[PDB]
Every structure is written in C-alpha cells, then in structure tokens.
Symmetry: C3
C-alpha cells in the first residue's frame, strides 16, 4: 500500500488501560485495515515491589510495570505517539518485536526528556509480542527496571485452534512478569537510592549473577492476589497473555490447565493442548486459553516454585460456580 | 455421566513398584472406564544423595524419590488413598497436574501425621503429568525435599505418532529428576541436621540462589548407573517418561535419539521427531519413544553437562544385541 | 547397505571453512547417497574472549570456536578424519548427536596426542545437530573450553515449510554460542594460566555455580560485530543455524523475525512461524529462516539481555537495500 492509500485508511484512537486488564477490542476484525492510534507517556518513578517496602526506580511506559497491552488486528497499522516528559532524566525509545525494521522501531524512536515521536508500523504477523526500551549501551538495565510490555495482533478472523475451529474468549488478562535485581547491603537488606543513577553500578553487579532478587507479576509480589486477584466463573473462557522481556518463565494454572497454548505466542503456529506447565523464553510473549470447569481459588504461577513462592511469581484466580464431583471428589476427607 | 454410572464402574486395586520401574498396565485400554485405586504411604526420612555421605531429610510419596508412576487411561478415574503415619511430623497433601479442581487436589488432601484421605478425579486429559506435595506456605521446600512424582494417562487406544501410526513400546521407564539444595558450612562441607525443620532457614537461603547443589535421577548421584543401569536390546522400543517438578531439564539419550518426543508430555499435542536433546520445563513431565538400533552403553543425561556430570543428572542404558556397521563403523581405529 | 555397497558409493572431499561461514554445498542433493569426507585437526590454543584480555585455554575442532559446520544430506555417510597433533597434551574425541551408536562416536574416536582416527556414520536423520568432545570423566570441562560445533543433515529434497512448499535460502550462517566459566582472583580480576590443566580446579568451582562469566558467539565478545557482522540484502533469504552444546539459549533477530524456525533443529518436525524469540536447549542446535524486508543494522542476540549485553551474546547483521515505508515509517521524528 502507498502513502496515499494508508492516509485514506480509517483511524481509531484507543484509550489504554492498566494491566492486567486490556482495552476494549473486538476479537473478529471490524471492517478493513485501520490505523490504530495509541499514546503513552514514559514515567521514571519510584515503585514498591514487596511488603517490606523494597524500592525500584522504574522506567514505565504509561506509568505501569508492565506497560499496557496494545491490541490491533493483522495488517492494521499501529501508530504510537511516544512521549518522554521533560521531568525525566534519561533518553528512551521503543522496540516492537511485532514490527519489521529499524530494530523494531528502536532506531526511529530515540527521544530525550522533553521530546516525543510518532512511529507507525504494519502489524504483518499475528500473535502476542513483547515491546521494550532498547537504548544502545544500557538495554538490560532499562528493561529490568520495568520498561517493557506486550501487544496482541489478532488474526482478522479472531482466534482459532490448530484445526480451524474458532476459539472465542469471554475475558482476557495480561500478565507481565518482571525479573528485578535489587542490591543488598552487608546485612542482606535491600538498598534504597535517591536517584536512579545512584543504583546502576550495584545493580549491574546483581544482574551479572543472573539471579533475580524478585520475580513478580504486574510489578510487585502479590500484585494479582486478594482484592486484585483475577476472576472467572465455571464455564467461562479466558485468554491469559503472559510476557517476559528478559528471562525465561514457565506458566501453570494450578488446579486447571492450558487447553490451548500458543507457547511461542504466534498464532500461525498451532497451539499445544492440555498443557500443565508451558514455556515462554525471555524476550517473548505467550498466550493460553482455558475454559474453567471448577469453582474455587487457583494459583497461576511461574512453575519454578522457588520463583513462584519465594521470589513473588504467583497470582490467584477467584472462580465462582458449582463444584463438579465427577471431575473430582473427596471420597474420604482428612481423618484419623 | 450419571451418578449411578460412576458408582457402578469396576474398581481395580493396583500395586505400585518403585522408580525407574512401572507397574503392570496395558497400553490399549482393557474394557470401559474404571476407578483405578492406588495407595501411597508418606515417608519422611534421611537419605544419602551422593558419594560423600551428603544427607537430605526427604519427604517421599510411597517412600521413594521420585514418587512412583501411576498409570491409567483417559476417562478412567484415579482414586488415591494417601496416608500420613503418626510417626511423621509434617503436614502433607497432593497436587495432581492431571486433575481438575481444588489446586489439583491439594485443597482436599491436607493430612497431618495420623491421618489419611481418599481423593478421586477423572483423568480427562491424556499424557504424562507431574504430581507433588503442595501445602499452602511450604510448597517449594517440600517439593525440593523430593515429594513429587508423575502419572501417565494413556489414550484409550494407546499411543500414536503424528500420522496416526500406532507406537507400541516393549518397555517403559520413569526417570524422576530432582534438584536438591543442601546447605554448607563455612568450610564448604554439607551440613547435617537432626530434624527436617532444623534445616529450613539454611535450605531456603540456598534455594533463593536458584542454584541446586545436586541434580539427580531416582534420588541420588549414580542411582541409575552401573549395576542399576536401565536395559534394552537392539530392536526394542522403549518409552522414557521424565519429570521435573521444580526446575527445567533437557534430556538426551547420548548414542541414540528421541524418535518421537512429547516434549510437553501431552498426547493430544503431536510429538516432535528425531530429537537429539528435548526440553521439559520445571513443573512438567515429558515422554520420549525410541527404538534401539545399536548395542552397548548409552548415557541418558540432562544436557547441561555441568548438571549431568558435576551435579549428578546422568544415567546409563546397557543394551544387548548386534552392532550395525552400516549405521556406524570405525574405518580407522585410533592409531599413531 | 553392505560394506561393499558403501565402498562403491561415490566419495566427495569437502574443505571446511571457519564459522560463521559454511562450506560449499547444494541444498538439494546432487545425485544419490555418497560418502562425504571431512578432516579436522584438534588445536589446543589460547583465545582472548573479551576486551579486558581475558584468556581461555581453548580446545578447538579445526582451530575454531565453535568447530566448523559440516553439511551432508540424509542417508549420505559422513566420514570424518580426526587428528590430535603431537603438539596437544590431552586426549580428545568426538560425539555426533546426529549419529547412532557408541555414544555418537565418542567410544570409537578416543585419540591421544600423536594419534588420528576415521569414523563413518550414516546420517539417517535430517536436521542440525551438535557435536562435541566427550571424554569419559572430563566432559563438561572440554565442552565449555569450546570443543563443540554442529553439522547439518539436509533432506535430500532440500528444505520445505510445514505445507510442503520449498524454502530455498540465498545465504547461510552458523552461530556457535559458548558459555565460559573463567576463574577470578580475590580482586575480581580474571586469572591467567600457563597450561590448560593449570586452570582445571578453579574452573570446576566456577562451573558449579552454573553461572557463566561470559556467553559469546564465535568464541569472543563482539566476534560477530564490526569487521565481522553478518551481511544480507533486502529480499534475500537467510538460514541462521545456532547451537549451544551445554546451556540453553533464546535467539532473536532484533528488527526482523524467524519466519520459519526449526527450534528443535530437526527438519521432520514442522517449523514454528513468525517467531520473535525462539528457544534452543543446552546440548542442541536449531535453525531459523528469514527473508529480509528492511535495510539497516540488526542485532542477533540471546534474548536474556544481560547475557547478550553484559555477558557477550550479541551479533550484528548489516543489510543493504531500499527502506520500506509501508512496513514502518517515522510519522514524526524525535522532536520537542
Ligand atoms: O532491542 N533489543 O532486544
Ligand atoms: O501447586 N503448585 O504448583
Ligand atoms: O557425550 N555426552 O553428552
Ligand atoms: Cu527507556
Ligand atoms: Cu531505555
Ligand atoms: Cu527485544
Ligand atoms: Cu508432603
Ligand atoms: Cu508437603
Ligand atoms: Cu505444580
Ligand atoms: Cu577434546
Ligand atoms: Cu575432551
Ligand atoms: Cu552431547
């Protein structure tokens, strides 16, 4: 398509919402290709990542860790207006794994504090993809400071299983997983810093151990539990998009399964089925589809249980509904 | 299925055998759905895991690490009687990744010493699945203390390749891989403790480094080598079920291949073929089918060779039969 | 085939080239089965792996790290003459994951300094496979000293996608990823040694942490950048073979994609498509096929960005051609 043809295309402005929720969208594409517009302001800000009050000088797209999920359809154009406020101190940019060229847009979006840029790319490949800051010379630090998220490019005909059968979810959740490397003092207590730069040297040292001090969902230990636990009901079909821009993860819905899992996150690659624990390599997004059959609490975790329960990679699902004794029943409850 | 129908199903008690061996079963189901009954007694006991007398206070299903492999067919019901003797001191339960509901059954099987429980669940999905102890608050600790195993839910029609061609094995082995985190004193000597709880704080510290001191098959370094090597003959078809409940692994039959590998461990997902090294994420089981073509010794290992030969993740296969010079031959033996 | 039938097959002597380039070959098999001959001299030599002058006592096949890529077709016989010069001080051998029997040939190829051997095996399975030194007793050490490579066994009919369409590449590159464990002194400085054996005790201790000090492509940090960046042109089809003999990796062509990726490295296993980041387990090789659509610099990395940018696992592609504004364009360049 020529510039003229693209300028004639309809344009829709979408308002992003904070993870784990996803902005309103249609699974089946409406009309022909469109230029979907998104705006995100970068905010360098202090966030607390655990109950002890541990701090991280985050670099967050739209002010959240992970950045929000942007949703478009295959062959739509994603036009992102990216803003780096003069209140920030570092240069920032964005790399869309879903895009093609200039390091995912990285080479065309380098913005200093006080600048903005508008990048447009054709979403030619269907699936979920990671996006993240990629400044030449300080990539890992910015990424593990939370500057990453994901987008979903839906097939124009919505989701289907490997054999051509439609898969329509009732709800969708985006679980961004983040590995944090927080310096500790001689007492083994997490250190705090006045400015983000102050922490760089100590942090690089921790990063070199390839051992995160924290592995969390939605920016903090327990962020998706309690009044913020995800929800569903027996019978409900749920799509769980999961991303990790720097380190491997292995999602598992404890008490359930991954009925259809596009482990590689790409829709033209048939999904695996009946999964117990699936695998998403660092630098990628994956997605799992499940129809709940039992009510009660579920633990959604990175299945290296130390990472899940000692480091913070665990969420919960609260599911309402009738218990099914055919699937499972306590013949004899715990007793003498 | 009606209520009367389940109650009318034939009940069958099966006697378990210790890994790497598997209890008697039929690949193709025999008769309609059944309620397959198993019983496992929990044993807390000190075991030696290496050639240096290193000890671990194990928590073991049926007294073995890994716990035994339970085999049923899709749509049978697995009815497990789980016993926690009054001689034990810790709380236990069981999570079946193959099951649906109550956190895999963990929420219905919490038993203290002196208690027993009976759990029944319908094996609705075919494949090999991990099962492990999972009491709220002490999940990773108990799991890395060896309280995990796997089950196999065979398709009623047995296994088939991606083209619908039946895959019938002559022998089946279950290799459970265990990551252990044993504390060391300031001199580097592994510590010993009087009771399980005594080692808790020291052990969690090692666990948080995400670096196991040992990675073993069947509970100890060398457990599946020498006089305990697994066996086969040229021409025999063997299925090797492999599990790892907490950490990733990458099996490889050195000298052979994985002719058909259900890397994810789920039979409705077509197997990969001609594999050199496959990958099983922590929290899952996988299965590899192979037809031996050459006699001799084979090393079956986790292919991060440091984990295999420095940490303990290596086993052997001793295969009888005639050598095939077409496949391989020494044209010129080592010489000056 | 009988010994006589094999002896009558046509022979072809191949001259190997240093990675990332690959020796001349035909994607589609030229004629029936043949005995393809290769010769590799083992070289124990010092290599400098980073800009701080860090040394490693390398054990390199054909003098490089990784060893060169050998290409044959399915059902051809690979006949390798391996030489261990009197100048070397260690026993060496070779294990081909592509072969069948005697530990991949390791049991039939043990040669001391001053010895040579000739091994022939039938390449019965198509795909890319790892090969590495495998002495009984000192495996991980030699492997992580750089003694590993890969071979490609192409289907007689060349490559095809999952639907049977031919995938013909214009260029092919072989990226060997190496994890190094270099000892340091109490001041955090990398130690140097006068002979290979001198660093053994120290290296094992570092290997036990399972945390490499360096993760590099083609033997050194920046080896595949600058004067050695890989090249291509818009419209060109490129196959990127990638191997890791001891540790997991997750390749990603930043700016592009993996249009077709045989992640497990085996050609009879359908390739995944439109990949952002793929996964290759330690002890295996994989291959990705991509058609460039945009000119410019691309970063090819292990997508754990710490491993890529702090540890060394990063390469570059320099692509020439016309920029495609339909796929990506800067609507608004960085500005106030
Ligand atoms: O922009 N590097 O993944
Ligand atoms: O039951 N938690 O993996
Ligand atoms: O030959 N050991 O991977
Ligand atoms: Cu940034
Ligand atoms: Cu940045
Ligand atoms: Cu990236
Ligand atoms: Cu237990
Ligand atoms: Cu327990
Ligand atoms: Cu589990
Ligand atoms: Cu060697
Ligand atoms: Cu060697
Ligand atoms: Cu190997």
């Amino acid at each position: 398509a020529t510039a003229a043809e693209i300028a004639a295309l309809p344009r829709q402005k979408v308002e992003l919402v904070d993870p784990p929720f996803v902005h309103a969208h249609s699974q089946v594409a409406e009309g022909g290709p469109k230029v979907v517009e998104f705006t995100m302001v970068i905010e360098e800000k202090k966030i607390v990542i655990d109950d002890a009050g541990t701090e991280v000088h985050a670099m967050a797209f739209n002010g959240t860790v992970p950045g929000p999920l942007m949703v478009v359809h295959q062959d739509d154009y994603l036009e992102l207006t990216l803003i780096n406020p003069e209140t920030n101190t570092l240069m920032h940019n964005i790399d869309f794994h879903a895009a093609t060229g200039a390091l995912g847009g990285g080479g065309l979006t380098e913005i200093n504090p006080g600048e903005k840029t508008i990048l447009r790319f054709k979403a030619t490949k269907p699936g979920v993809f990671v996006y993240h800051c990629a400044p030449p010379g300080m990539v890992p630090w910015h990424v593990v400071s939370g500057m990453n998220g994901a987008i979903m490019v839906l097939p124009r005909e919505g989701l289907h299983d490997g054999k051509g059968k439609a898969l329509t979810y009732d709800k969708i959740y985006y679980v961004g997983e983040q590995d944090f490397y927080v310096p500790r003092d001689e007492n083994g207590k997490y250190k705090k810093y006045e400015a983000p730069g102050d922490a760089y040297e100590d942090t690089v040292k921790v990063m070199r151990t390839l051992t995160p001090t924290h592995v969390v969902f939605n920016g903090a230990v327990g962020a998706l539990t309690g009044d913020k636990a995800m929800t569903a009901a027996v019978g409900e079909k749920v799509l769980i998009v999961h991303s990790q821009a720097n380190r491997d993860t292995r999602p598992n819905l404890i008490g359930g399964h991954g009925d259809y899992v596009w482990a590689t996150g790409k829709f033209n690659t048939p999904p695996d089925v009946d999964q117990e624990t699936w695998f998403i390599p660092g630098g990628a997004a994956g997605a799992a589809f499940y129809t709940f059959q039992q009510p009660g609490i579920y633990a959604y975790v990175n299945h290296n249980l130390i990472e899940a329960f000692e480091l913070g990679a665990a969420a919960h699902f609260k599911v309402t509904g009738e218990w099914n004794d055919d699937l499972m029943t306590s013949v004899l409850a715990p007793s003498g």
